[PDB]
Structures are given as structure tokens and as C-alpha cells.
């Protein structure tokens, strides 16, 4: 149950169900991009295939020429050569009837990418397989990476 | 984090109740529900540090160590199922239960029978999707003012499972209508169903039934007819489920039931609204000197028994558990 | 869609143009006659519409 | 150091010991300051009250003038002198058992300044103000003395004084360090006091012509926190203080600014107040705060047989000829007994009065009298109010700041009477909300992320007019009153005032009015003075009457007779809530007679009063 | 602040602050200083036999042949005695006057004259006004970007005459706030953020038209006025200004106006002499500060007898009418600089009340004004 | 970046205030060249959009002769490169700014 | 419209004044109009009872007509024409 999510579930695959109430706009992310030194004119190619799905951008641009002067932050992204993938943010809420009587239903921010984007519409009742995770805005914000969307039978 | 506010009973008159932020850690989380008195002990810690007040001022937060409700009432064990069978074997058990319904009230046994019927409810059924039949019994209390319809509904709230209390008009935490509202402090959308949706597998007590808004009336009609409230706002297109038994209290037109008129002229509700009901018990005021005498004796005894300085029915807990097990 | 004469609890009986939250731009919130298109629509309490 | 500061400090500590006020015949002469010091040791308190009159008397008041004009400058010297005096006599209470802060409060200043009398030339001086408390904040800690952890040679400096603003310890626990760039505060070695901000407001009587009300923010530091509830007139004594303000950035006039590098800093401030203390303006505690003549007075009233009649006649001296309304209002002031059954349902005891009548029938007159006589009351008109005003209100603490709760009209009427004039005119949404609170006895706030749920135990005294302006006899109450039947049902009592062309009453009223205008407060002949009435009322409230077997039988019989009267048509029908109304009215009458037991006579009187309340249509 | 073209600020409303202001060393001209020669001149004028008519025609000099209306306006400007109670409370002598009648009867001009003369006053007109607009409102001062409290027209007009034009056109919702102001001289506001009572010692001067924008003799007086009785009870004087085709009156009015059109900026065509507005304002002010009438016993007996006489469908008598005669007699005495109230003052007040409502031409049982009988030049 | 398709080496735009020899320069409006620039937002067509769901929009950058060729509420068929601009937060301060350069 | 506007501005500069005989004529006309309104106060042609605003309108129209001839002195024929216009404003009713 969405209310039963616990710190013991962090970074573990969790099975849970709810209702999709909002689907954010597709945001394009980087999976392979070509960069250049403004001084060295030194081409390079960074790959971010390893979980380009956290909310924050992790594998960042280098601040010095490869193997290391070059000058801090000399890298510019060559956009016509990079390759991109899309990311979409969903927000899940507990089933409205299965909630404490006078308490706002608990909603949890969720993220998906690649072929799982544009798979649901708001109001659909879905079952989620994904990695319970932690995002820093001492406290932390929980969220779920999407691994699979078991979309139930919905309105035709 | 749980925000604790002083109980209004102990607050001296004229003073604003104060809120203190109680911090819960480890397995202490989700051991309480809002609106429930608590008795918690912990460190009165000084919170970390705004220049809003100008002077150097720190916030305070009470870290918690042990919280006990002042007080699973619906839990089960083999011995109490044996007990349930034993009391069920009695004769006149129906009358015993009816006398148990609303023990604080005197008279109107028809109302007690109706509310007991609504609580126990009919058998839910679904013929493979071919035919669907409501498994709930809806009770309407159309009575003259000051006949304890409100108190009866409060008792039902106390004694029912998955029970929500809604009002026809005014201020309430449940609005009988599905809505998509954004909390300004947190700035995000929430899909909140009405009291009908919240009471998906229980009862919904609707007081001031005649004094409903048009939207509330339409939502009531939808819930009573199709048992599924549908929402089509802010991009959310879905049909929430609400299979609820409605116990409603309404006032006849003019604050008094006119007997010479039919039910149509006595209540502003239209016929399609009433037809979905099952037990339409009109609580007409009766002018009998002896009945009034017995009522006054009951009221006076109760009122004197409540003074701070001067001082066959089934027990309520057994009624709770037996009703739950019967429905389950 | 099974729609009452006054409409559903919140769903409109016919198409309604409103503004979305995040940019206040024009879009169709819903309506029985457009959400159910190409199929049928069942309208009860027709005289109360 | 300053020689003048040393002089004033040594004089202060000198007369803390040498001063001695006479006890006249009884007690010879005693050291009042030493007596207060002994009292302090006995009760282990933290604040000493010093009369300004004594300081004015001593040494031709030169020291009094010096300490009044420059209180802030000499305050540390005052603290040091008091500490040395405490060391001299009874130094046991010096320490907390680390160190206990001693607070000095001056009381009985010669003059009182209103909020509009605040002037810049009085900044930092000692004075007194009188205002009405509007908003009270939480009691929060403040850094009396602040300790920190060092950056280089990480270690904690212990018990360093914290000024009005953030301070950095120049010295270090390691003397060789002399580094202070990064300090990390520790709560353990940091002292604290009690801080609470109260927003006072100018009283109505002090407002000039046309000016909208003016208000001031008062900070209560010390034991005086939470000493005043919202909606009370209090007298504040303290030092005039200034606090930095960043809002007055675009105001006309050259903005003072400091240049230092650059070192720019806008020196914009707003005036506030730091009050040393606050003074407001069972039967045992009540019996204690009376004088012997006052006790004799109250006791004499308790025994009199005519106490009921004299009390009824005394209410609203200006109004002539209406006794039912006076009886009802007196009962309402006497209140009732609010009770909770074993079930948890609560039975309110306070009485609700609804008055409807023809124009100019003194309907407001009673409302205007109740305010200014009841211990706490709020008077409001019809169109000049809203729901958020009547119940709790949500406002920003400051513009673009966190929202805070503000006590509404009913909150100031808690355990009191709230007079609402022209109920019919006042808005239908406000109507629904006010009545809903009358049923609930509580108010819930859920706006802008606040979930405070207050309690409203208030007595409603509401006046109105018949629809169209003038009452019509043939039409029933519900026809001439816009309100619906249950709204009347929740009310305990009703009085309908009628107009008629009777020459005798017209002549008597004309003479009464003209005499009131000609001779003012002359020969109005009140049976008792207002203060005596309030003394008796306060005492009666202490009692909690009890019933008898005859009382039960008579109550049942009277309810039976009233129900038999109903459709024996009636103006409005009878209920069991009417039975509860008779119960509460009977116990209120017994409280009026100061009798712990209700007699059948009281029940008969309450039943009769309800019978005149239901006038035949 | 002070000007000789307008009345001086009332000292009674400023009695509380002046003693402290003298210490404050503000040293502003709160009140105009009256010379000994001016005081002697004022006393000499008070000794004149036609004082009342002279002061009546001095107000609004260009307005022709509105005699009772001008007299009532004069009495309102003088005001009643400001009584104070030792126990608490105060009865203020603010006179509220309603003007109702046919269009083009120079009601708006009288309203403008009063709005000019008084020290403090606001001129509002019907649909323009609003309930929060009168009373008080919360506004955002953009300079400080802070929610700042601001007062409305009624509180602004404190201590003066609030002129309300097109009174009938006001919605009854907006009119509700006038109920407390016209009687208690205070407004108690308990809106969001403010819970207090405000003093509004303003005497209302309201002009309106009968329903149908013209008087209908068939309808009764109360139907033609068409206001709730609780409101009309608060008004101390109600004027039925009537436009009737009288050849002599029409000729006189036409001559007056056409003569007003004889120069570019001509002088008044009023044949009778008038007091220049500077001295008239000085006189009215001085009578306000230094006269405080007290009712005598004979006046009390006459007041009781008159009240019983009126209190015996047409407009009904009221205790507010009794307090209205009290205030009007006090004002008439205060005009004459007398320190006490006599019988003739009460007689004049009763005459004014009877004449303003045109009681000398109305049938008792049915309030139909006898059009032939009511005719006056 | 917009005015050219291929990513050029970023040269910061510094307005020449002084000559190479320190002489003061007076900007010559009326000889300098200015190009009209307009951004329009294109939203999914209501006729083809799914009913009851929020719309999706893209931003179009028009330039020179393409400006002011449309009125709000028109139905248009804009063709151009679907370029992505900016570091897109990859450089330390959630995706990339994406827009359709207008052809 | 340019020339007309110029002439209208020039006429607006002037401030003509009435005359004694003109005033007598206007007063008599107003009296007669008031009597006529009183007579037919409920006839089939009751275009409304005359009011002093009718007199003021006659004065205003006469002054405007005087301005139109560029004269500082109101003329009797101007008043006659103003009366004619006010009367024939309702002439199409028949
Ligand atoms: N049949 C009854 N037996 C006992 N008490 C009753 C009965 N009917 C009404 N009362 C009492 O009458 C009082 C009026 O409140 P209530 O009847 O609940 O109001 P309402 O019916 O108007 O909502 C309550 O204290 C209630 O307990
Ligand atoms: N019985 C009365 N006793 C004393 N004064 C009265 C009485 N009746 C009317 N009045 C006077 O006439 C005025 C009526 O005012 P009031 O009746 O309070 O207004 P409202 O009818 O709107 O409530 C008051 O000055 C009041 O003192
Ligand atoms: N009796 C009168 N004395 C002076 N001027 C008058 C008189 N009757 C009408 N007028 C004039 O006619 C016009 C009508 O006055 P106005 O106040 O506008 O009318 P209303 O009474 O409808 O508000 C004004 O120009 C006024 O000078
Ligand atoms: F035609 Be008027 F303004 F009464
Ligand atoms: Mg009820
Ligand atoms: Mg009143
Ligand atoms: Mg007008
Ligand atoms: Zn490089
Ligand atoms: Zn160090």
C-alpha cells in the first residue's frame, strides 16, 4: 500500500498500485552527447546510459580537458551530433476511497523514460513496478523510478 | 511530523489554542490518525534556526519517545465467533438489537429498525456483469425539528464501519462531490472524492438533506443510481466507485410535516431522488400527553445524571463486532 | 457514458472549453457528447437538462 | 568606563537597601525593598516590582527623572546593582539551581500614554500605554546569552552574552586561536528567556475624528507571557523601543544610510514596545478579591427576598416599561450550566435571546446596554460584518508572510454574550455560518493550510426587524420573520415588541425620554449600582444549582402542559428542546436567587416566561 | 485647515485632543480667532428680530423660494446639543434630513451648498456609493506594498454633513449600514482583520425622488417615498418638495433665473439682503462652540403634549420623532444664542416637522395630498 | 545559437564602447542591422486532440520574413528543424530547451 | 469638418448675454409652456410636464444660437428659433 512505503524499501523494487492524476510534459534528456573544448577544440563523447533517470543530472560535464591548463568549464555541447531520449513525470495518488476519512490522500512523485513515456493518461488506475528512491530537494523526498506500468482495464 | 494542538476541552475561554510540532521517528510513524487525542512524552528540543521577528528567536519542536492513544476494535478471535453464534442462537435477537440501536434515545422504534436494516444491509450481488443490483439499503429520516434525527445520525457515525458524516450545507471536510483542488502551501493537485466516494464500503450520513446545493443533489443522484461518481476535470477522466448506503435526515417544508399532503408536497426532493430510497420513515410529531410524559421523564433523568456537582439490549462493543462479522 | 440530465457529478453533459491549470490555455475539459464519440451516449432524466 | 553610570548604579544599590516606607500606626516602619527581597526568597520568583512613586519621593526625584529619561542606558547598571544587593542580603536565590535572570519591573507611572501619543523623543525612555490585545503569538525562546563552537581549534566557548542581534565571541576557549570566522552555536551553554509578541490596538474611546484605528506591536519578555487573552483591555508598562524595518523603502523623505570599502546599510526603523509587565483593566479566590464592605454588600443582596425583583428592575435603567426583555437578558448574563453526558455529547447551558419588534422599540438599546456592562461582549451590526470576521480569521502575519489566526467576534465572546444587531440585514452566508457555530459550539479553520479548531461557548443576543419593516399581528412569527423554524428552535427565548397608540404609555415614555435628555443620570433611580450588580453576577455564576424530586415532577408536568397548549394556531410549535430550555432557564433562575436547589416555583416562573414568549397569534 | 468660506471644525469632536496638543507644541490653527468687534457684531445680529429668516435665506442665496427646506438645512448645520452621560454613552444632536420630491426642484443645488459650507463632508450619489465604500476598507498602499487600513465616506464625513444624492437609486443592501450611523452616530465594523467600533458623528442629508421620478397624488405619502419604515423613522425631517404649476411662482422663478443670466458672473437676484458667507460661517461656528442649550420644564410639557398629539397609511409617529423635536428645539435655541430651550423653540420645531411632511394638506385616513390645498407661492 | 543551425563556438556578446585605441564610440542607429524576431507557441489542434486531456505545445522561433505571418488562433503547418538548445542543466546550475526553428 | 470645426471653435470663444426684453419674452414663454403642460397633464399628447430645466434649456439654446452668429448679445429672433426647435422636436408625432 502507498501508505505502507517504508525506509526499508529504499532502492528496492516495490510493487504498488494507485491512480494517475497528472502526467507532466515530455522532457528530453541526454543519452549520448558530443562536446568540445573552447580552447583545445578537442572533441569528446560522453555516454550517460547508466540510469539517465534520476531527477537530478548526475554524470556532469568535466571542468578540465581530458586527463588534464585547459581552463575551468571549457566544454560546449554539440547539439547537432548528440542523441537524446525523453522523460515524463507522473504523479500517483492513493485510491481516493481507500484513504483516512479527513486526511488528504498521499501522493507520490514518479518518473519514467524511453518507451514507458506516454503510456498512461490521468485518471487511470495502474499497478507500478519500480525502484523506490530518494531525492534531495536532513529530510529527503521519496520518489519511484518506473520500470513497468501494469495499466489496468480503463475507460474505452 | 505530527502537529499537536491542545485539546479544546482544557483550553480556557477566549484563548487561541496553540500548536506544537511533534517529531516521530523510526517505528513511531503512522501510529496516530488526525482528530484523535494522544498522550505523548519526549524531549522538548530547541529547533534549528529567519529574521522575521527581528530579535534572535528559535523555534521549538518536541521530539517524541512514546505515544499512547487515550481511547483494532474490529479485530477477531475464535472465542468471539463462538460468542457470536451463541447470542445469534437466542430468540428475539432482532428486537434485542433494535433496542440496542441508539441507546441514548427513547421512542421511534421504526427509526431504530430502519437504521439497523441500513447497517446490516442487503447482500451485494453481481450476475457476471449481466445484471447488477445494489446491495445496500438507503434510509431517509424526514422528521419535524427537534426529534433527534441529528443525534441518531451521530450515533450511527459512532457505531458504523467505514462511516462518513456529511452535511447538506455549510462547513464540512467532505463535500459530497468529486473535486480537483490544489493546496496553496504545497501547490499540487489532489483528487478528493465526495463523502459518497469516501464511504465506498460503508454508510454516508447526510444531514440537512433538503438543504443541498444543486451540485450536491446531482452527485447524490448519480451515486444512488449508478454507484459510481465520474470526474472529468483538469484532464482526469475517470469514474470513481461509490457503493454506499445512504442514511439521510431531512426536514419537511415549513419546518413541520403536513399530514394532509402526500410525500411529494412535504419534501422539496423530487421523485427520482426519493425512489432510490427503501425505508422512507416520516418522523411526525405526535401530541400524546402520556408519550410526552415518558419522554420528559427520560430527558430529565438523563439531564440530571449529567450534572457535574450532583454526581436485553446488547453491549455496544459486542454490537460493533457482531455487526461487522455479520456483514463480512 | 451514462449521464444524468443535469450531467454527472462533475462531468458535463456536453462539450465544455476551459483553461488548463499550468498555462490558462484553451482545452476541452470533457462532456459526455465528445468524450464518448463514435459510440452511444445514454442520457437519463432528459427533461431535467 | 563611565563615571555617571557608576554613580547611578551605586545610588541604585544604595537605596535598594536604605529605603524604608512607613507602615503608619500598624507596623511602625519597615524596609519595603528588603521585605520584597524576603518575599522573593520565599517564593523563588524572578521579577521585582518597584513603584515609581517611591523613587520620585526619594532624593527629590532627580534619580527618578534620570532613570525614566535614559532607562535603556542605565538598565545594565540597574541589573548589576540589584545583583550586588542580592549578594548582600539573601544571596541564595542568586543562582538558578546556571544563573537566574532577575527582572526589574516598574509600576504606577504618573502618566499614561495612548498609542497615538508615541513620539520619537520618548524612544528608549520609560512610560506606560493602554491598548486592546488583538493578536498573541506563541511563547518562543530567545538568545539571552549565546554559546558557539570555534572554527579553528574546534571547541565550544561557554556562556557568552547575546545582545539584541547576532554576536561573535572575540575571545576563544584556546587563547592562542583568536579566530572567530565560523562559530557553531550550542544550545546547552546558551541561555534563554520567554519571548511573545502581542499586537495591541488603540481603544475605541481614544480614536480621533475620522481616523481609522492605529495599532502597536508589544513584546512581552519574561514571566508575563500569555498573561492576556485576545480582546482584552490591558495596561502595558515598559520601555519605548525601536526595531529595524525593511518595508519603508519607497516612502517620501531622505532615507538615512550608513557608509563605511562601502559598508552600506539603510537605517530604516519602525516603533515597537518592550513591556516589563502587563496589568489588565472557586468562590474562595473570588471571595478573596473583595473588601469587607463589598462582601457585606454582596452578602446582604444574597439574603434579601426582593433580590430577584430589584435585579430585574435594575437592568437597562434608560429603557422603561419592558420587563420580559430585562428578565431574559438578566438570565442570559447569569448564564447556565454546560454539561456533558457519559456519552460524550455536550449539553450547553448558556441562553440565547432573539428580539424582534417594531422600529424604535429600544431593540438596540438593550444590545448597547449589554456591551459595557457584561464582563466580555462584542457588538456588531448587520451589513458591517462578514463570516471571517465573526468567527476566527486568517491573515498574514506580515505582507508576503506566513498566515496567522485572528480571533473573531465570537472568540471575544467566549463564555460571554455576543450582541448582533439587525440579524435579518446581516448576510445570508454569514447567517448560515453564525447559526452553524451556535449548533456546533465550535469553529473549524481549514484555509491557507491552518487546521486550528477553536471552541466557541458564546451567548447570542440577536435583534432583528420583521420583513418589510413593521410587525404584522395576524401573520405568525415565521411569516413576519425571515428565519426558518429550526433557526428559531435553537434559540432558547423569544421576545416580540409591539407598537400601539396608547395615550398613557405614550405620555409616560415621552416624559421619561425628555427627562433623560434634560436631567442626565438624575432621578433614574436604579435599585442597585452597576458594580454591585456585576459583583452579585460574578458570585452567582460560581454556584451550580441542583434539582429535587419535586423539581423533576414539576418540570415534567409543565412540559406536558406546554405540549398540550401546542395545537390545543401557535406562532411556533413546541419541542423537547423547549424542555431543555426550561431546564436551563430554571437553573439560571435558581442561580439568580443564589439557591443551590431549584424549587417548583422557579420551574413555574420559567414556564410562564416561555408562555409570554409564545404570544398567541 | 481653517478657512472663512467654510465652517470651522467642531470643537466638541476635538475636545479630547486639544489639551494634549497644546503640550505637544504642534501650534496649528485648529480654530479661527474671533475678534471682540466680531463677537459684538455676532451678538448684535443675534438680537435682530428676523434672525431665523435671515440666516435661512443666507444659506444657498441663489436658491429661490425654498423656505422650509432652507430653514431645516440651517437647523442641521447648527446641530443639536451634544449630551454626555456620567454613567456612559452620549446623545448627539446630529439632524438627518431627507429630501424627496419632483425633479428640478433644486435639491442637488442645496446639497452642493451644504457640501461646500461644512468643514468636513463627502458628496456621494446613489449607485456610485457602496457599503464597503462608506464605512471602511482594506487597501494595498503600493508605495509601501503593504495592506493599509483606510476609511470611507461616512467616517471621512465625521463631524460634518454627509451629502447623499439619488438616495432612492441606492440598493437596500448598501443602505443597511446607514441604519446604525443615523441613530447611534457610530459604525461597528467586524470584517476580516478588524473587530472594533468607529465613531461617525455625521448628519446625513439625503436627496431622493419618489417612485416614478415624480409625485403621484393618488398614492399615499409613504408609498410615494417608498422606503422601509425603520429607515424613514431615523430621518428627523422629511421634505416633500413639490413642483406645482403656479403662475405667480413660475413667473417669479423665471424672472430670478433670467436675471441671473444678465451678466457673465452676476450677483444674486434675491431681493432681500443676506449675510456674506464669511460672517455667516463665523456666526454658525461660534454658536456651535459657545452655546449649549438646556431644555426647560415648560418646553418639556409642550414636547410631551405635542408628541401625544402626533401619536394619535400615513406616516406613523415614533419615539425618534420625539428625540427629533428635542434636537430641533435645541438647534433653534442654539441659533438664537440662548443658553436654554423655551416653548417657542418647540413650537417652531413642531411647525417645521408638520410642514416638511406637508401635514397641513394630507387626509388623515388616506395619505393623499390635496393638490389644490397644498399649493403655496 | 538560434540564428545558425550548426553549433558555433560561443563568443560572448560585448558591445564595443571604446575604440581599440581608447577613443569613445558613438553607436550609429540607422546603419546597424536589425532582424525581426518572433516566438510563437503551437498547440495540438483541438479537432485532432484527444478529448478530456491536457494539451501539448511546442515553441517556434521565427525570424526575418517569417515574422507576423500568423494570427493567434490560426491553424498552421510550421516546418523547421527540431533543434535543442542550452546546456540543459548538464552544466552545474530538468531537461533541454527544445524548440522548432522556423523554416 | 475642418472648416466647420474652426468656425465652431470661434463661436465657442464668444460668451453672449441675454437682454431685458429677451428675458421678458423667455419668462412669458416659460409661463405659457408650464400652463400648457398643466392643461394636458393627462391628454393623448402629454409629452411631459414642463420644468425649470425647460427654461434653462431655452436659455442654453438661445445662447448657442447667438454664438452661431458671432454675437455677444442674445437676439430675440434667436429665442424665437429656439422655441421653434423645442416645439417641432415633437412635431413628427402628428
Ligand atoms: N425521542 C427522543 N428521545 C429522547 N430525546 C430526544 C428525542 N427526540 C429528541 N430528543 C432530544 O431533543 C434535543 C433536541 O436535539 P435534536 O432532537 O437532536 O435536534 P434535531 O432533531 O432538530 O436535529 C436533543 O437533546 C435530543 O436528545
Ligand atoms: N421603552 C423605551 N425606553 C426608552 N427609550 C426608548 C424606548 N423606546 C424607544 N426608545 C428610544 O427611542 C430610540 C429608539 O432607538 P432603538 O429602539 O434602540 O432603535 P431600533 O428599534 O432600531 O433597535 C432610543 O433613543 C431609545 O432610547
Ligand atoms: N426653486 C428653485 N430655486 C432655484 N433654482 C432652481 C429652483 N428650481 C429649479 N432650479 C434650477 O433648476 C435646476 C434643477 O436643480 P437640480 O438640483 O439639478 O434638480 P433636482 O432637484 O432634480 O436634483 C438647477 O439648475 C437649479 O438651479
Ligand atoms: F430630477 Be432631480 F435630480 F430629483
Ligand atoms: Mg437536526
Ligand atoms: Mg435598532
Ligand atoms: Mg438631483
Ligand atoms: Zn581541453
Ligand atoms: Zn579557537
Residue numbers in the entry:
A (entry chain E): 147 to 214, 235 to 303, 322 to 340
B (entry chain B): 387 to 435, 439 to 460, 472 to 711, 756 to 772
C (entry chain E): 437 to 485
D (entry chain F): 104 to 200, 259 to 421, 442 to 462, 500 to 786, 790 to 838
E (entry chain D): 468 to 779, 789 to 853
F (entry chain C): 217 to 309, 315 to 324
G (entry chain G): 635 to 728
Could you share sentences copied from the article?
Notably, Cdc7 is considered one of the most crucial regulators of the cell cycle, and it is one of only two kinases that are essential for the initiation of DNA replication. Cdc7 on its own is not functional but requires a partner, dumbbell former 4 (Dbf4), for its kinase activity. When Dbf4 is bound to Cdc7 the resulting complex is referred to as Dbf4-dependent Cdc7 kinase (DDK). In the G1 phase of the cell cycle, the helicase complex is loaded by ORC, Cdc6 and Cdt1 onto the origin DNA.
We discovered that in the presence of ADP-BeF3, DDK adopts two different conformations on the DH, namely MD-(ADP-BeF3) state I and MD-(ADP-BeF3) swiveled state, in a ~70/30 distribution, respectively. In the MD-(ADP-BeF3) structure we did not observe non-canonical nucleotide binding, however, in comparison to MD-(ATPγS), an alternative canonical nucleotide-binding state was observed. ADP-BeF3 was only present in three Mcm ATP binding pockets, while ADP was seen at the Mcm5/2, Mcm2/6 and Mcm6/4 interfaces. This suggests that in our MD-(ADP-BeF3) structure, three interfaces adopt a post ATP-hydrolysis state. Surprisingly, with ADP-BeF3 we observed a structural change in the double-hexamer interface, with the Mcm6 zinc finger becoming repositioned and the Mcm2 zinc finger adopting greater flexibility, resulting in a gap near the Mcm2/5 gate. Interestingly, by docking dsDNA of the MCM2-7-DH and forked DNA of the CMG into the MD-(ADP-BeF3) complex one can observe that the lagging strand of the CMG-fork DNA can almost pass through the Mcm2/5 gate, but is clashing with the flexible Mcm2 zinc finger. While our previous work had identified that the lagging strand in the context of the DH is pressed against the Mcm2/5 interface, our data here suggest that the Mcm ATP/ADP binding state is communicated allosterically with the DH-interface, inducing a reorganisation of Mcm6 and Mcm2 zinc fingers that may occur during helicase activation and could support the escape of single-stranded DNA through the Mcm2/5 gate. However, our data show that the Mcm6 zinc finger can still restrain initial DNA unwinding. As such, the MD-(ADP-BeF3) structure may emulate changes that occur during the assembly of the replication fork and hint at a potential DNA unwinding mechanism.
